[PDB]
Structures are given as C-alpha cells and as structure tokens.
Write a protein that binds this ligand. Sequence first.
Ligand SMILES: OC[C@H]1O[C@@H](O[C@H]2[C@H](O)[C@@H](O)[C@H](O[C@H]3[C@H](O)[C@@H](O)[C@H](O[C@@H]4[C@@H](O)[C@H](O)O[C@H](CO)[C@H]4O)O[C@@H]3CO)O[C@@H]2CO)[C@H](O)[C@@H](O)[C@@H]1O
Ligand SMILES: [Ca+2]
Ligand SMILES: [Zn+2]
Ligand SMILES: [Zn+2]
Length: 214
Amino acid sequence: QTGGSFFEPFNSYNSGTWEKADGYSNGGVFNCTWRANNVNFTNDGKLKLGLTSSAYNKFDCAEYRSTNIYGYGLYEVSMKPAKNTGIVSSFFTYTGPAHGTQWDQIDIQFLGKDTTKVQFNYYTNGVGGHEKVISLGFDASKGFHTYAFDWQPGYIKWYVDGVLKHTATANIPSTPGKIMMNLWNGTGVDDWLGSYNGANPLYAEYDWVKYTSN
Ligand SMILES: OC[C@H]1O[C@@H](O[C@H]2[C@H](O)[C@@H](O)[C@H](O[C@H]3[C@H](O)[C@@H](O)[C@H](O[C@@H]4[C@@H](O)[C@H](O)O[C@H](CO)[C@H]4O)O[C@@H]3CO)O[C@@H]2CO)[C@H](O)[C@@H](O)[C@@H]1O
Ligand SMILES: [Ca+2]
Ligand SMILES: [Zn+2]
Ligand SMILES: [Zn+2]
C-alpha cells in the first residue's frame, strides 16, 4: 500500500526511502542528465540538488524520489529554490506511464527566471492545464520558507507559510505517486522559463519534507 505519514530531515542519503535518479535524461524539455553525484546533503542537514557542467553546453541535474508511493494527505516542504533564467526547482507528486499508471501529478515549481513567484499545477490522466502563478511577497531563493499542498478527493489547496494561496476543485487526481524534488534546465521552452544561459553550478536546497495521510 501507499506509504504512511512521515518526516524527512535530509540528514543523509537513505537508499531505503529515497532514490537518486542517475544515468539518463527525461528528454524533451529537460536539457540535462540526472546524476546521483548531483544529489548531496550538507553538513547542516539540507538536501542540496545541483545543476552542474563538465562539458560544453552539457548539463547534469538532479532528482530525488521517494521509493514509496503516497496518496491523499498534506504535503509540506521547507525549501530554497535556485535563481537563474531558464531553470526549475520543484517539489511534486508524480506517477505515469514509466511507472505503469496513468499520468497523475501535483506540482510546485519555482521558475528560476523569477523566484518572487511560484507555479502550481496538476495533471489527471495526463490532462493538465491547471497552471496558476502566485506572487509570493518575497524572493524564495533568498531563504527557506514552507510550501504545501493538501491533496483531497474534491480539492487541492496550496499554502505558503500556512497561508492559503490557491484552491483547485476540478478533476483532482487520485492515483498515488512518488514524492519528488528536482532541479533542471529547460530547452525549447524559452517563453515559459526564459532561455538557460549555462550558469553553473546552481543549487536548490530542501530542509525537510513532511507528509500527513488522511
Ligand atoms: O523505472 C522505470 C523506467 O523509467 C525511467 O525514468 C522515468 C521515471 O521513472 C519517471 O518518473 C519520469 O517521469 C517524468 C516525466 O516524464 C515528466 O513529464 C515529469 O515532469 C514533471 C512535470 O510534469 C511537472 O510539471 O514538474 C516537474 C518538476 O519540474 C516535472 O519533473 O517529470 C517526471 C519525473 O522526472 O521519466 C523518466 C524517464 O522516462 C528510467 O529512465 C528508465 O531507465 C526506467 O527503467
Ligand atoms: Ca533538515
Ligand atoms: Zn516565510
Ligand atoms: Zn486561485
């Protein structure tokens, strides 16, 4: 069954509860290869995802994924996304074809082109289009703040430091998924992310993640 409530402080790599994407690229808009070497833990207990390069116009990025799958409940994360044109730092639930299910996800994405805003979205059976951009009232890249989504049968509610910022009720996903965090540079989506200018290294940091089931 779907995993139970938990609290992850990111003190170290726990290959029992989390996995590091490694040796492949998502392709498409993801113009980088996931590297386990890019998922690291600081001395002070922060997950630190890195976007790096060791070759011309060639980038290595990072994705950390839960081994367990999770359903309806409250998802919270304290993080500090990267700031730079053409990148994304994220916290999200995901399942899809590569997992042997329909595409259901709920996502928080910080577009590096403007870290004073955040984007919320979700997909149900591969149908998305629920994008919402929210002004934060601060630059997220400058400190750790707490972001969350409460995923329930008839709604998703997103919060920033406990303040309700947006509510969705239409066609809410139901297929349990992995909790994931990633940092990556885009290609072919300059209008959305800005073009990426190869700045490296860049990092997204996460202090903890908490999930509370129904
Ligand atoms: O293990 C099985 C097999 O699959 C492989 O990797 C898969 C991986 O399992 C899977 O999670 C992955 O899913 C990605 C989607 O393709 C991509 O669309 C999705 O993008 C989301 C956005 O939709 C969302 O808005 O924002 C977030 C954050 O910015 C974004 O990530 O992201 C997911 C997760 O990365 O695709 C992989 C490749 O198909 C392995 O490659 C293969 O070797 C394994 O055998
Ligand atoms: Ca921590
Ligand atoms: Zn705050
Ligand atoms: Zn709204």
